[PDB]
Design a protein around this ligand. Structure first.
Ligand SMILES: Nc1ncnc2c1ncn2[C@@H]1O[C@H](COP(=O)(O)OP(=O)(O)O)[C@@H](O)[C@H]1O
Ligand SMILES: Nc1ncnc2c1ncn2[C@@H]1O[C@H](COP(=O)(O)OP(=O)(O)O)[C@@H](O)[C@H]1O
Ligand SMILES: Nc1ncnc2c1ncn2[C@@H]1O[C@H](COP(=O)(O)OP(=O)(O)O)[C@@H](O)[C@H]1O
Ligand SMILES: Nc1ncnc2c1ncn2[C@@H]1O[C@H](COP(=O)(O)OP(=O)(O)O)[C@@H](O)[C@H]1O
Ligand SMILES: Nc1ncnc2c1ncn2[C@@H]1O[C@H](COP(=O)(O)OP(=O)(O)O)[C@@H](O)[C@H]1O
Ligand SMILES: [Mg+2]
Ligand SMILES: [Mg+2]
Ligand SMILES: [Mg+2]
Ligand SMILES: [Mg+2]
Ligand SMILES: [Mg+2]
Lengths: 368, 368, 368, 368, 368
């Protein structure tokens, strides 16, 4: 019988009276009721999007998006809720009106050479999703295996310096995995509630792997937080070389992916599509390791970082806290500016910091 | 087989040759045939809308709408029939073109203090419907229980002077109910054919209740004629205080309803959505008890009331007739003017009447 | 989205903690949950069946079925709930196993002649439903008009003594209707809550009528409580003549109905299908009027009535209470026994009562 | 287009080459392919059933079912996979052929009185699920709130000694919750991967609560691992009194649930339906706290426990490990035997153990 | 269950890394994914369109379309892929913007008379498809038989000089078929992979035939490469007479087709619809046999042919290679220019060639 009544959407509304994520602040009864009945063609629903945020109220003073996407169509189907969140996260970028430009030309960047004072090592990271396949939060076992197959077959075609091997987690010893993790060259099993609540730890470690070059200066994580996570690393300060390797490797990987008929998810409004809305746009997180001595006990570093648009997090991972005054300094925003612009911004900020690490003298200028 | 023929819509057309309600005057074969096949998403149909009017031909010289709505979508689905009725009821207000503005600021109203000559007591009343739940004419048992749960849980959060208790009719003794009714602080079982024909007496008294404050100056009827009926009362003439209490209590109730994820039905064209189209807009019925002595022997009292836009009905209820020359004087129109405007109109009219109760002298001016 | 959840059936379960009808006693959560999804092809649902019982808790010590049927298929679709009720009502008749036999031969009955002591007048009544048309609780305006048309066209073919006229309620003056009602020759507007809650007073008086013979000894009510109510009256005590007229008139009416291609609802298990399950089987209520003197002062009147299988109700209608010690004495059970058997039982019972009216002497024997 | 091909079921088959749960041992490609396309009416699928087992390979030598049910229909829809698992878990009970009998009569049990040597305290526990509502793994927010409403309203009717209060986790301070947990009178947030992977920690702590009597000897957990978890506790050894209180409280709770039209999930083959197949049947876990001295240094304690059909786990919870030689001794099997039989078995086993705690002398007999 | 996942479109993408047809060059992952799910009303799909091109990589330096159409709707449904291919084939004609004009008036053409030096014989050919019937690649047996019936019944009405007989391949001896093929008056069984991979050799020789006039100067192939192939032949050089016969015969055939209610597929953008996109527009291939002596030893013959827009292929068929320096010289483009224009172009080109066959003297001018 069709005379039976469904639960009113307001009956399903989450209790967000003590939540501290952008989803909680931007979710309203009207929006929830409007979107309560829609779904992406693959079956992704709003409740599945906001489950991670609902489960984790979020620590006060710490900003977390609290939502994930199950496929490319999500950002279009549930745009009424994602657009305010994307705008709030990326310092006012408006997906509805503005457009994103991608530029990976490593020739444009200048400077490059650093001073081995507190940089230690430099890293650049991005993420890519294969079009036509569900994202990690929603992907089935078959889709995850398909992503792994596509990526591995493509990377098999890499030649020259960017030639390496793919290691499957299921086939890797626990000691080897721990050693790789400690060396910053591997990812651990998701333990933080954000990923588990999002449903991104299902079937672990089935179809998760790491492809790395012989020099271990070019890595690709397969099915950990996104379909692919491309990392270019260097135990030095020649950020120009790291970014050049990153750009050429990414171009080769994209060419090989397109060879077999696969494409990366990408649209003009949002750029490269990923799971966490915080990673939209370019997904670039060019950064460096930074030490305590000249950076732990100066005057007003947080103001300088905010003015320079630099993020500082705890070494060893986002979940881990800073220890011994050693942090990771990267960029804040992904959507909007381009990869070259973000790398140049990071380089200028770190140059200013090593210039404004005053311990020999004083006169920190901040210089917004 | 699809070759079978349905009854022509004109076969179902009601016999309204001796009817005296706006539905009968505005229902035509073309409109009925046009709307005979449509239905709201919850299954409400035109025949269900007009059943109350069809069953009751209506006493001549007495205007009754003769229709009810089963949900919010009704006024949009069957607008072709409701819009003329709404326009006729509310002295020409056009839902299709005009817009409604709601204003409950008790600061705007002036005067307030009355003279204890015939006012005796003052009262203000409105109605509210919870969005997502069917209206009393169409609500099932589960929906009615859900409305009761939402309202009771919300009112549990009221603090301060507006703190009271919820009494369930099913748990209330017959003597207590009779005492409350005789004291004007309760509602009786619907006996008048208008409500029973509309299907608003089903499952009585299941899920019908009354929440009242300790002073019994603030009451809320749950599931009698609408989802909620909010009443602010005073055994005096300080209409300003009554309206201030009404406004603040309504604001608190709305805030608590929204806190749990529920909203009141409301749209710009019609304002607050209710069952009887006569109550659309604000649903406000600010009024006062009035005695016989000076008003009963008035020269042209009906003319003064009509010019001042004041409705006069029999004390003890709409169904009951005036006895002993004691009536209830309230406002006429709900849609269009705002709550503050209606209260000010009622206050000005009653001030004029107490000024134009001439028995000491003569010279009634009417003063349209 | 199909991921939305419906209200659990137990959420819709009626609150029957203070009900006194067979529906309340025989309705259980399991049965309700089982039957809450089914519906007859015309859309009749269980809640519609039990609404009349739910609305009216029922006076204690008074037995009311509390359910109605919206069409013929109802008794088959909701048999799980009706069968226990039918069995309880008709003193153990089992619809699932037993079968009903119809016999209207007035030749079999003997005696007939009564004594003009307390009988005053005699009456016989049955009801019939036209197959293919919804019953009064569920019939639309078109279906009711179709029933009226079929019955009127058929009755137009009656000849001989059973020749009369059809009077439409909508075309009868109030005084004429009141006079007919007072003369026990007409039906009044349904005012008792049992019929109104069942939805059998909709569109009154549209398509309700009375066809009566010139002698006013053979009447047919059209669309009051069933599609047709056939009555044979006589202001006397010659029950044999009344039953003979009843039988021949019913046979002629059935023949004329079948002539145009219409049939009466009927099946072996239940006999003639009607709205109230109490009227199933034959629907026969052969009875008489009885006075106060020798019966009001009866020694063990209820015991004799129960032993003889006779019902006593208030004169002027079931709703009206007995006044002046004058009652109506009829039979109790309809399903099971046949019409001839029922009339013979009534005749024997009235003969015994008039013989056991002892006021001249004593010695009432009851004689179960 | 319908010419597109779906992923073959074998493409979705989990990689169970290193798994140690009954699901892994009993799941085969044929069964998976057969059940890959079916679903319960509420949308529960096989992958959702086996996700918890797939995610957790299971510690070797530790037996875990590895599956959960999302509703009552699951055990019928996916019986082809659950039946072998149920049979293996409950020492050969065959759901397809055998039948379960429930008996809670506390009069049958004898003995009861214990010796305060190592018992310390006694406890009895069962679980119940409200029919018509999805189980914790699959329940939405609205369904969980409905379960809480039903249980709280029912328990409000408890009188006599079993009269207490309901405390909502969302409204309980962290210190109070920790104190209750430490006192063995509360449940903590699910942290063990078994529940989180099953999706039973969603929306925590929304709609989870604890209703306990004034003496705190009768508790009911609402929405932690099942819809309801009923516990009868005593800081002593009078197991007879504990079981009597348990039985009478459970009977009263069931009566109050049925009063409003709700039923507990229950069928003859499986008994009371719960989430973990290990808890099917009665869900009874009558047990006691046991100390180290005469049991830690036991000669062949595991053999005696296995022969007596007594399970021993770590104090403080199943996840926690035994500390200080203090364990919890309860029964092993739930389906099959009845509640009285299980309680009698536990009492006899503990009596034997306290008799066979030989430290004063030797001669442990095991006595299978 | 609808939770099963389909193969991503990129999984079905053909491997075209070594292909040399316009389909391979113009097919891209985005286009394939966009069109992977669409289909014509008769069930034709993109994979069926491109199967012939996928199977045959294509000889380098030889241009083949690599696609076929299964019905008229194909060119509209899959226009996103056909339009670039049509534009590339027909020297830049844009189907989306430009329009095609058909003109068969044989009066406009001038000259006509040729010199019997290398012409030997002249031929003109076109193709026509009956609307409402699937094209040879997709036609079933019934549709092919219907096409044969329509064409044969129409041609039966031809009178005058264009009067002949229809010969069925199934009823024709192998020796007779070979003799007809050798005389250039018949078609052989499709052996070249292009037609077989396209599915145009199914059920051979069922419903394939040849209708030829008594003089054998007017032939019509039924169901070989298209529904109808109309050929006008002459063993001479009077191209004017051949084209006049062609025009009048085509007009008569079209009139007779329309008489019975059938139409030729035709739309303004593309002209006459046929299977191979290379034949769209007019399908006209006016041409002549050409010998070796003067043309074989030509100085820059390919340049002259390209400048004059004349195609040269091997005698005996497209599959066969040129032998003895004898080729077939026809027009290149079909869509765009009209039939009269194409015939005039061919006549002018052959006149120039016979004038620029210089062996008596030198001075070839090419004269673009
Ligand atoms: N600049 C860096 N240099 C060296 N290692 C790094 C750097 N940034 C991140 N890592 C390594 O990457 C791992 C995970 O980094 P994470 O914070 O998850 O990056 P993201 O936020 O981009 O996912 C950490 O264990 C850390 O050791
Ligand atoms: N101004 C007033 N003062 C005191 N009691 C009132 C007043 N207006 C209404 N009531 C009480 O409310 C009850 C129902 O009022 P009703 O006419 O139904 O109001 P509405 O038309 O807004 O529903 C009556 O029994 C009456 O005693
Ligand atoms: N035996 C009878 N003799 C005369 N009038 C009768 C008799 N039985 C019923 N009536 C008249 O019929 C009217 C309705 O009867 P009712 O109690 O409804 O019968 P039923 O239960 O068969 O419908 C009453 O007003 C009454 O006057
Ligand atoms: N016999 C007992 N005596 C006292 N507390 C107990 C006993 N059994 C269990 N508990 C308490 O119950 C809590 C959870 O028990 P748990 O192992 O989850 O039981 P179950 O397996 O029935 O859920 C523990 O924190 C523990 O303190
Ligand atoms: N100009 C011509 N003169 C004589 N015969 C021809 C001529 N053109 C084609 N043919 C004959 O037609 C047959 C098939 O021609 P084909 O190359 O398939 O034409 P199309 O490309 O139009 O289908 C060949 O066997 C050939 O003998
Ligand atoms: Mg990370
Ligand atoms: Mg009212
Ligand atoms: Mg009656
Ligand atoms: Mg537990
Ligand atoms: Mg050819």
């Amino acid at each position: 019988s069709e005379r039976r009544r469904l639960y009113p959407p307001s009956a399903e509304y989450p209790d967000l009276r003590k939540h501290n994520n952008c989803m909680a602040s931007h979710l309203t009864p009207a929006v929830y009721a409007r979107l309560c009945d829609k779904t992406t063609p693959t079956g992704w629903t709003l409740d599945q999007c906001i489950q991670t945020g609902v489960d984790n109220p979020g620590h006060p003073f710490i900003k977390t998006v609290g939502m994930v996407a199950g496929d490319e169509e999500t950002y279009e189907v549930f745009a009424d809720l994602f657009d305010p969140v994307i705008q709030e996260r990326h310092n006012g970028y408006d997906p509805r009106t503005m457009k994103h430009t991608t530029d990976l030309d490593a020739s444009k960047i200048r400077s490059g050479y650093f001073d081995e004072r507190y940089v230690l090592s430099s890293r650049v990271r991005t993420g890519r999703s294969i079009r036509g396949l569900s994202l990690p939060p929603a992907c089935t076992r078959a889709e995850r295996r398909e992503v792994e197959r596509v990526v591995v077959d493509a990377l098999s075609g890499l030649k020259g310096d960017l030639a390496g091997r793919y290691y499957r987690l299921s086939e890797m010893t626990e000691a080897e995995q721990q050693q790789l993790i400690d060396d910053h060259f591997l990812f651990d099993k998701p333990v933080s509630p954000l990923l588990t609540a999002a449903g991104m730890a299902r079937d672990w470690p089935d179809a998760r792997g790491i492809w790395h070059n012989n020099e271990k200066s070019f890595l690709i994580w397969v099915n950990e937080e996104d379909h692919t996570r491309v990392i270019s690393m260097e135990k030095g300060g020649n950020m120009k070389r790291v970014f050049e390797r990153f750009c050429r490797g990414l171009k080769e990987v994209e060419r090989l992916i397109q060879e077999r008929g696969w494409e990366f998810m990408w649209n003009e409004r949002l750029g490269y599509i990923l799971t966490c809305p915080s990673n939209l746009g370019t997904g670039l997180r060019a950064g460096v390791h930074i030490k305590l001595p000249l950076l732990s006990k100066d005057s007003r570093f947080p103001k300088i970082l905010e003015n320079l648009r630099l993020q500082k997090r705890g070494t060893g991972g986002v979940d881990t806290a800073a220890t011994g005054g050693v942090f990771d300094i990267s960029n804040l925003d992904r959507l909007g500016k381009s990869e070259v612009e973000l790398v140049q911004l990071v380089i200028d900020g770190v140059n200013y910091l090593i210039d404004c690490e005053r311990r020999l003298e004083r006169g920190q200028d901040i210089r917004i």
